[PDB]
Design an enzyme around this catalytic site. Structure first.
Site, mmCIF file in Angstrom:
data_model
loop_
_atom_site.group_PDB
_atom_site.id
_atom_site.type_symbol
_atom_site.label_atom_id
_atom_site.label_comp_id
_atom_site.label_asym_id
_atom_site.label_seq_id
_atom_site.Cartn_x
_atom_site.Cartn_y
_atom_site.Cartn_z
ATOM 1 N N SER A 144 76.076 -1.784 9.637
ATOM 2 C CA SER A 144 76.898 -0.825 8.879
ATOM 3 C C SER A 144 77.813 -1.595 7.931
ATOM 4 C CB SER A 144 77.541 0.203 9.814
ATOM 5 O OG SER A 144 78.356 1.112 9.093
ATOM 6 N N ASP A 242 69.607 7.684 6.298
ATOM 7 C CA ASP A 242 70.750 7.184 7.054
ATOM 8 C C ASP A 242 71.839 8.248 7.154
ATOM 9 O OD1 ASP A 242 72.178 4.427 7.988
ATOM 10 O OD2 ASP A 242 73.595 5.661 6.854
ATOM 11 N N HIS A 286 71.576 6.091 12.493
ATOM 12 C CA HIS A 286 72.496 5.112 11.915
ATOM 13 C C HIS A 286 72.656 3.930 12.864
ATOM 14 C CE1 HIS A 286 75.463 3.453 9.297
ATOM 15 N NE2 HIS A 286 76.441 3.544 10.180
HETATM 16 C C1 LIG Z 1 81.538 1.232 6.386
HETATM 17 C C2 LIG Z 1 80.092 1.622 6.414
HETATM 18 C C3 LIG Z 1 79.822 2.859 5.599
HETATM 19 O O1 LIG Z 1 79.530 3.913 6.152
HETATM 20 N N1 LIG Z 1 79.929 2.810 4.226
HETATM 21 C C4 LIG Z 1 79.979 1.733 3.347
HETATM 22 N N2 LIG Z 1 79.922 1.964 2.064
HETATM 23 C C5 LIG Z 1 79.867 0.782 1.340
HETATM 24 C C6 LIG Z 1 79.669 0.850 -0.140
HETATM 25 C C7 LIG Z 1 79.987 -0.341 2.083
HETATM 26 S S1 LIG Z 1 80.072 0.048 3.758
#
Ligand SMILES: CCC(=O)Nc1nc(C)cs1
Ligand SMILES: *[C@@H]1O[C@H](CO)[C@@H](O)[C@H](O)[C@H]1NC(C)=O
Ligand SMILES: CCC(=O)Nc1nc(C)cs1
Length: 340
Positions: A144, A242, A286
């Site tokens: 993640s 996801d 996920h």
């Molecule tokens: C923190 C993980 C998530 O769900 N989202 C994220 N978005 C970016 C762009 C990096 S991590």
């Protein structure tokens, strides 16, 4: 069990100024897996204050336990971890709330420290005195936000080891569930990341920074844009549907939503066409790599532990041992092996 070590350099800190650290289980007969935990992020004073009240282990080491149990790819039992299992195992807790990109200390102007990029560098540094100096492969993995962290940091670890005088260690990356799209929502990540970078003093890989230039570094947080700039080998694991991607897209089935979901899977599949080492099943889920039952999912008859083993062999195609595994069927759970 992996044992906690708080960083000897106590100036490398979690959000609240407590020392960061790592959990380690050595395997003396093996020449290293360093795993980055995930857990969202925060991008201003108000939302970081909220996270400090109810997600404090992600901002502080004061309450961390002395040990943790390795699971999935961090397991030392071959029954649970057919890949590796005999490796030296490292779990790095996520306590910087910066997608592992920050380089800023707590000070009279900064209520919180955001030191994710420096935490990784300091862990590698202190491990070299505990056996990492004799490694032949260092696999930097993560899930993640930790998966995005791999993409942002793998080449910096390689450069760090070269500059310290260890050119024989082969640095590689495994990015799980951190390959996101800056797509149209069904009803935003780019703006939140742009604000975060300013708040954190966030840093991105040098080649990607030079392409996008000042003010546009947010682009390098998106896998399909940063991956082609990287030099270290990286294996990408991503569910085609996801759950975190769908959540930020405001999806929680009529024709409009059917077409939206199908187009999302097609777009993700397209971004992986030129990624030779990848595992992308057609499931709504996920994360994967640290789950105990991570061995169950298969793409086209091949599990993720097998694909990773085939990747190892390719870095010494191979008859019957593939590394590029992306579903082509167009709806969640059209693959029968999807997590239930
Ligand atoms: C923190 C993980 C998530 O769900 N989202 C994220 N978005 C970016 C762009 C990096 S991590
Ligand atoms: C501790 O880490 C900081 C941040 O990287 C660095 O500037 C400093 O030199 C380190 N101190 C020691 C004694 O290594
Ligand atoms: C890359 C060439 C090749 O086939 N590699 C092999 N690895 C093993 C483990 C046996 S053969």
């Amino acid at each position: 069990d992996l044992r906690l070590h708080l960083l000897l350099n106590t100036s490398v800190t979690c959000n609240d100024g407590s020392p960061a650290g790592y959990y380690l289980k050595e395997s003396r007969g093996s020449r290293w897996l360093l795993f980055l935990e995930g857990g969202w992020y925060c991008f201003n004073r108000e939302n970081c204050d909220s996270r400090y009240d109810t997600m404090r282990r992600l901002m502080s080491s004061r309450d961390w336990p002395r040990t943790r149990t390795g699971t999935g790819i961090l397991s030392s039992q071959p029954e649970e971890n057919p890949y590796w299992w005999n490796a030296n195992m490292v779990f790095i807790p996520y306590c910087s709330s910066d997608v592992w990109s920050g380089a800023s200390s707590k000070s009279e102007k900064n209520e919180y420290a955001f030191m994710g990029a420096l935490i990784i560098q300091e862990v590698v540094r202190e491990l070299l005195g505990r056996g990492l100096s004799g490694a032949k492969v260092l696999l930097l993995a993560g899930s993640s936000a930790g998966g995005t962290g791999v993409l942002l940091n793998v080449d910096r670890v390689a450069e760090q080891l070269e500059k310290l005088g260890y050119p024989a260690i082969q640095v590689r990356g495994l990015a799980d569930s951190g390959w996101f799209l800056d797509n149209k929502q069904y009803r935003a990540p780019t703006e939140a990341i742009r604000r975060g970078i300013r708040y954190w003093n966030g840093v991105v890989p040098e080649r990607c920074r030079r392409q996008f230039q000042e003010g546009e570094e947010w682009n390098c947080f998106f896998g399909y844009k940063v991956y082609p700039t990287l030099r270290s080998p990286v294996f990408v694991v991503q569910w085609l549907f996801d759950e975190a991607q769908l959540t930020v897209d405001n999806v929680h089935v009529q024709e409009g939503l059917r077409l939206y979901i199908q187009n999302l899977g097609r777009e993700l599949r397209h971004t992986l066409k030129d990624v030779p080492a990848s595992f992308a099943p057609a499931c709504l889920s996920h994360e994967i790599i640290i789950r105990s039952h991570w061995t169950d999912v298969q793409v086209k008859g091949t599990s993720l532990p097998r694909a990773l083993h085939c990747w190892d062999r390719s870095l010494h195609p191979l008859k019957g041992c593939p590394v590029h595994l992306v579903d082509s069927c167009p709806w969640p759970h059209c693959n029968p092996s999807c997590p239930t």
